Design a protein around this nucleic acid. Structure first.
Ligand SMILES: [Mg+2]
Ligand SMILES: [Mg+2]
Ligand SMILES: [Mg+2]
Ligand SMILES: [Mg+2]
Ligand SMILES: [Mg+2]
Ligand SMILES: [Mg+2]
Ligand SMILES: [Mg+2]
Ligand SMILES: [Mg+2]
Ligand SMILES: [Mg+2]
Ligand SMILES: [Mg+2]
Ligand SMILES: [Mg+2]
Ligand SMILES: [Mg+2]
Ligand SMILES: [Mg+2]
Ligand SMILES: [Mg+2]
Ligand SMILES: [Mg+2]
Ligand SMILES: [Mg+2]
Ligand SMILES: [Mg+2]
Ligand SMILES: [Mg+2]
Ligand SMILES: [Mg+2]
Ligand SMILES: [Mg+2]
Ligand SMILES: [Mg+2]
Ligand SMILES: [Mg+2]
Ligand SMILES: [Mg+2]
Ligand SMILES: [Mg+2]
Ligand SMILES: [Mg+2]
Ligand SMILES: [Mg+2]
Ligand SMILES: [Mg+2]
Ligand SMILES: [Mg+2]
Ligand SMILES: [Mg+2]
Ligand SMILES: [Mg+2]
Ligand SMILES: [Mg+2]
Ligand SMILES: [Mg+2]
Ligand SMILES: [Mg+2]
Ligand SMILES: [Mg+2]
Ligand SMILES: [Mg+2]
Ligand SMILES: [Mg+2]
Ligand SMILES: [Mg+2]
Ligand SMILES: [Mg+2]
Lengths: 185, 127, 51, 172, 58, 222, 159
RNA sequence: GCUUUUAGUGGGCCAUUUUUGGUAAGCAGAACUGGCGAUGCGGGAUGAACCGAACGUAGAGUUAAGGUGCCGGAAUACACG
RNA sequence: UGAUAUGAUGCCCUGACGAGUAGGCAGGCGUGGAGGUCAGUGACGAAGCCUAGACCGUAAGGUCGGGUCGAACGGCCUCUA
């Protein structure tokens, strides 16, 4: 026998293909595992993996979030890459020109991008313009701004937001939530 | 006439029969695995029957091959039979159990023409 | 595909370690040593055979 | 314990700054190999002087062969041993052709007669008895008489086959 | 019907499966429990030097 | 494209240079080794001549074999056995001797056998059962390029370069030694020589430091 | 029934050091502590205020706060399979500056020196610490020292 | 390194060492570890816990603990009492 | 991923590992009914049943021959209990 120092037959724990069944997605992966295998460019590896990500791990990127990233000094002319969908933000009044490569653009989001004289590119189109991912800026959405996360880590003194259906006074606000009744948290 | 293969090794040829399938009529021979707490079979005590496990799995090279070296392929009619036209060194046709006698004479005939092997030619032969 | 023992296979013995050819040739494993006669002091022999 | 060799073992305390060249003690040890022999040395050394292997050093280890291996000798032998209920000093006499052979049978004897294993025995002294009639125990003296002769009655030959066609004879 | 009272038996086998995780040190530990008078001044102190380095890039 | 004998020549010619470097190296080690041995022999003689005692430097290198199976081992020795990379029976590794290793050996004495390996048994350990660890994957040695590839940055382009680094306990001994997968030995072909193994060597058993007697054991297990 | 109160089991732990009772010498109060300092915790039985609980006796930690009569000390205490951060308010009588880092601070300052002196001559440093090495060979002389031969000794009594 | 979510469990018992009650117990109760429980395989005739050794299907070699008069594979082996 | 030949979850190279109750997960076997398909099988004999006859699968199971029989039934992709 062996005195095993490590658990045997352990799966790496990382996705391999996306769990999705969509042909077009499976083709883009076909494209980028090739690109990742032959290009030595780190960008392609980062993209290939992102395509496997489940919907929760690929939050949308706002069109205003895009606009902010090009305000980095030196980055104004880079072409932003979002592996996921891009959403419209009504609350910015001026959107730069640039170029956005994404999986999806909402109707209003690509409209805004296009009205400033910008471009909306699919990742394969991005692939052909930038096989090594040259001059690209990759943006990720805010993963932990999701609602479920508010309830994660619930416990005494944790400040963490109960799982509750109705709210308002006289829903889980009395004994244990204030000094007057019992104790507080 | 079969594509050449390594010598075929069966590795356990004896049937795995349910424990006590020999003891009571109510217990079929079909394999079923002991879940009992005390059971000598599940605990692998020396002297008892052996249970199926993946170690017994056949060599990928010769797996599915028959003694002759051909994989067998079920055949209803000529069209089915003709799917073997380009592989006669790999597959052999086994004629389906419910094919009529008169139809079997046609499948055999075309089989000969194409050089496709047939595993049960004597089936329903009027002789 | 199949590991070969340098200690039983002269081919691969010579593959690793080219010095093996001259070693065997100059015979080298049976080397004779310089003959010197230096002798141990009386103190050494006395305490050896002491009680 | 095994077939014995006799070793000279020399050791000392590690040299200190204020005491370099410490005092060099020797023991003669009977053991089957140098590994046991050096062990035994530290065993008795810690029973005498303030040291232990960790603060000491083995200076030299040497095997000592019999001076006259084909000459018969009367050995007087001195031993300390532990019994079940106490510890005791003994004097036995052994007659053999080398010290190393004598210590062999001593250890056998102590095992057989007094049930002492090797751990329970200290060889105090082994020395040749130079004048006969300094020989004390009579199971030896017996063998020092002049013109000594004896027969070996009732002899058993070992058979090489399971069956015999004769019936045997113990004549000699 | 009495029964076992207590034991620590097996408890450290368990502790060691996923465990005895080292403390997890951080640069910039929290100021929690620090003297308020100090923290109040420390606050203004930092605001001033912040303003100071923005006056460097003015 | 040329490449036919063209870059085959640029290759074969370069291959011939490496074997050349290897020849004069192994030729040197041999000189090194025997004049090191002769010198100690004469040290001992000259000291007796002077009426003195020549004591050798304590050994800087030992070879440990796990003599004990996998079950019912106390946790502390158990960790050590892992850290010394002996996780199964009769497998063994080389150890450099310092205070902070010697104390490790101490803890595992009941479960192992060890001593001072001769050049001979190191040589035959590596030529026969020597394997490297390359992206894990326990690669058999069998060609010198395998070594130069992985140990090259430390010097060491041959199998005998390796052996030399081990036996002399060189500057790069840690990297050299860790490179070698733990040796997998069979049981002894003579047998253990003792009636019971799990006594110390001194007590008629098999475990602990049997010193130079480790070579007789390992050679029968190799 | 059982008794688990705060100072239980602490009889000899908080006891006073033979012929050391009485007022605490004034140097204990003249010492000065800063945030980040590494201190050792040992309770002084004569000072009942600002006392460490017995669990932190013999424990070493870091100063996270400085106050009038006291210093706050964080300690990693392990409960379960994990460590939790503990914050202790201790009076200065129960705290002592630790020498646990002294050799390191010494070794750094000495290392800088050897490194500069090396560069300024050339290279050749070796400033990592090394374990006890086995001894080199040596020649021991029999002159003035001839080996004395010892034997084991017979059983005696002297009671 | 980090996050979420959920099963079963919440009668335990044994061995060396430390150890309390009891004349004691194959009794009752703690400490650390290793085990049985959940585990077959070789040894201890037999046996939950001992010794050895932890299991995919197989070939050749070598061994452990334990054995080698006959049952029974293996010296009615050598040696001193 | 390079077409002009057949599986890209594929094909090829290499290393290590394999005990298991309660329990988790995975990949598969089998049944009644449903959408699609093979212009599937069949009164020149469907289904069923019998058979120390044959063949494939580690296995759940699958396939054939022969006997008996008399009107219906199956493969594959999916749906459902
Ligand atoms: Mg919100
Ligand atoms: Mg009120
Ligand atoms: Mg059942
Ligand atoms: Mg049973
Ligand atoms: Mg049971
Ligand atoms: Mg009750
Ligand atoms: Mg009870
Ligand atoms: Mg209970
Ligand atoms: Mg109670
Ligand atoms: Mg090591
Ligand atoms: Mg043999
Ligand atoms: Mg032999
Ligand atoms: Mg025995
Ligand atoms: Mg061998
Ligand atoms: Mg009490
Ligand atoms: Mg008060
Ligand atoms: Mg849970
Ligand atoms: Mg529950
Ligand atoms: Mg639970
Ligand atoms: Mg529960
Ligand atoms: Mg036990
Ligand atoms: Mg009890
Ligand atoms: Mg149970
Ligand atoms: Mg178990
Ligand atoms: Mg077991
Ligand atoms: Mg034991
Ligand atoms: Mg009998
Ligand atoms: Mg026999
Ligand atoms: Mg399993
Ligand atoms: Mg399967
Ligand atoms: Mg199904
Ligand atoms: Mg169905
Ligand atoms: Mg059959
Ligand atoms: Mg057939
Ligand atoms: Mg019929
Ligand atoms: Mg029918
Ligand atoms: Mg009808
Ligand atoms: Mg389905």
């Amino acid at each position: 026998g062996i005195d095993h120092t490590s658990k045997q037959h352990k799966r790496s724990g990382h996705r391999t293909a996306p769990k999705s069944d969509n042909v077009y997605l499976k083709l883009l992966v076909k494209l980028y595992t090739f690109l990742a295998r032959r290009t030595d460019a780190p960008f392609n590896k980062v993209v290939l993996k992102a395509l496997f990500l489940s919907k929760i791990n690929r939050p949308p990127v706002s069109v205003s979030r895009i606009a902010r990233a090009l305000k980095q000094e030196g980055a104004a002319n880079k072409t932003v890459v979002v592996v996921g969908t891009v959403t419209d933000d009504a609350r910015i009044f001026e959107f730069p020109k640039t170029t956005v490569a994404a999986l999806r653009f909402t109707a209003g989001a690509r409209a805004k991008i296009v009205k400033a004289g910008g471009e909306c590119i699919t990742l394969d189109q991005l692939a052909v313009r930038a096989p090594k991912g040259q001059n690209t800026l990759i943006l990720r959405g805010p993963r932990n701004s999701r609602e479920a996360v508010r309830h994660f880590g619930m416990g005494p003194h944790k400040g963490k937001a109960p799982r509750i259906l109705s709210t308002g006074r006289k829903f889980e606000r009395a004994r244990g939530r204030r000094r007057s009744k019992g104790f507080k948290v | 006439a079969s594509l050449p293969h390594p010598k075929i090794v069966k590795k356990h040829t004896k049937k795995f029969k349910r424990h006590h399938s020999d003891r009571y009529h109510r217990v079929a021979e079909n394999w079923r695995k002991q879940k009992g707490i005390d059971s000598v079979v599940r605990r692998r005590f020396r002297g008892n029957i052996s249970q199926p496990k993946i170690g017994y799995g056949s060599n990928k090279k010769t797996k599915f091959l028959s003694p002759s070296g051909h994989k067998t392929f079920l055949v209803a009619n000529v069209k089915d039979l003709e799917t073997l036209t380009m592989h006669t060194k790999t597959y052999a046709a086994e004629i389906a159990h419910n094919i009529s006698a008169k139809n079997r004479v046609v499948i055999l005939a075309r089989a000969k023409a194409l050089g496709i092997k047939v595993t049960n030619p004597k089936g329903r032969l009027a002789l | 595909v199949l590991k070969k023992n340098p200690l039983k296979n002269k081919q691969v013995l010579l593959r690793l370690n080219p010095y093996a050819k001259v070693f065997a040739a100059e015979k080298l494993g049976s080397k004779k040593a310089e003959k010197t006669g230096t002798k141990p002091a009386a103190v050494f022999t006395e305490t050896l055979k002491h009680d | 314990m095994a077939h014995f060799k006799e070793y000279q073992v020399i050791g000392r305390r590690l040299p200190t700054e204020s005491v370099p060249e410490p005092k060099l003690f020797r023991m003669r040890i009977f053991a089957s190999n140098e590994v046991i022999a050096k062990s035994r040395y530290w065993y008795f050394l810690q029973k005498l002087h303030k040291v232990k292997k960790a603060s000491g050093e083995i200076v030299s280890i040497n095997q000592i062969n019999e001076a006259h291996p084909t000459k018969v000798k009367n050995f007087g032998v001195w031993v300390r041993y532990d019994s079940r209920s106490g510890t005791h000093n003994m004097y036995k006499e052994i007659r053999d052709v080398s010290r190393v052979a004598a210590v062999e049978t001593l250890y056998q004897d102590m095992a057989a007669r007094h049930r002492a294993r090797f751990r329970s025995i200290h060889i105090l002294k082994v020395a040749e008895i130079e004048k006969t009639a300094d020989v004390k125990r009579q199971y030896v003296k017996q063998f020092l008489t002049k013109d000594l002769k004896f027969p070996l009655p009732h002899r058993v030959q070992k058979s090489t086959k399971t069956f015999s066609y004769k019936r045997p004879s113990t004549f000699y | 019907a009495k029964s076992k009272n207590h034991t620590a038996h097996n408890q450290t086998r368990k502790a060691h499966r996923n465990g005895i995780k080292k403390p997890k040190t951080y640069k910039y530990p929290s100021l929690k429990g620090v003297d308020p008078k100090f923290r109040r001044n420390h606050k203004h102190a930092l605001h001033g030097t912040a303003k100071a380095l923005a006056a460097a890039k003015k | 494209a040329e490449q036919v004998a063209a870059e085959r020549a640029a290759r074969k010619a370069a291959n011939k240079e490496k074997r050349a470097i290897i020849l004069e190296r192994n030729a040197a080690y041999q000189k090194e080794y025997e004049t090191a041995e002769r010198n100690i022999i004469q040290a001992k003689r000259d000291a007796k001549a002077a009426g003195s005692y020549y004591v050798e430097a304590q050994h800087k290198l030992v070879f440990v074999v796990r003599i004990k199976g996998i079950n019912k081992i106390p946790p502390k020795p158990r960790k050590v056995l892992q850290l010394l990379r002996l996780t199964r029976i009769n497998s063994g590794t080389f150890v450099k001797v310092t205070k902070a290793t010697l104390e490790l050996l101490k803890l595992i004495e009941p479960y192992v056998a060890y001593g001072y390996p001769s050049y001979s048994t190191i040589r035959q350990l590596v030529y026969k059962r020597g394997f490297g660890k390359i992206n894990k994957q326990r690669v058999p040695l069998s060609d010198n390029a395998i070594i130069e590839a992985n140990l090259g940055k430390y010097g060491i382009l041959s199998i005998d370069d390796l052996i030399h680094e081990i036996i002399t306990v060189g500057p790069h001994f840690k990297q050299a030694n860790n490179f070698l997968w733990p040796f997998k030995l069979s049981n002894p072909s003579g047998g253990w020589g003792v009636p019971r193994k799990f006594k110390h060597f001194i007590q008629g058993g098999s475990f602990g430091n049997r010193e130079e007697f480790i070579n007789k054991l390992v050679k029968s297990m190799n | 029934g059982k008794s688990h109160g705060y100072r239980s089991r602490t009889r000899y732990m908080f006891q006073r050091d033979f012929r050391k009772h009485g007022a605490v010498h004034l140097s204990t109060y003249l010492k000065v502590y800063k945030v980040g300092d590494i201190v050792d915790i040992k309770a002084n039985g004569s000072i009942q205020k600002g006392m460490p609980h017995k669990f932190y006796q013999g424990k070493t930690g870091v100063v996270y706060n400085v106050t009038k009569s006291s210093v706050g000390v964080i300690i990693n205490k392990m409960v379960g399979n994990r460590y939790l951060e503990k914050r202790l308010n201790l009076r200065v009588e129960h705290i002592k500056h630790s020498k646990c880092r002294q050799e390191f601070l010494e070794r750094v300052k000495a290392n800088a020196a050897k490194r500069a002196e090396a560069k300024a001559q050339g290279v050749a440093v070796q400033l990592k610490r090394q374990p006890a090495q086995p001894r080199e060979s040596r020649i021991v002389s029999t002159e003035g020292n001839v080996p004395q031969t010892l034997a084991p000794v017979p059983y005696e009594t002297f009671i």
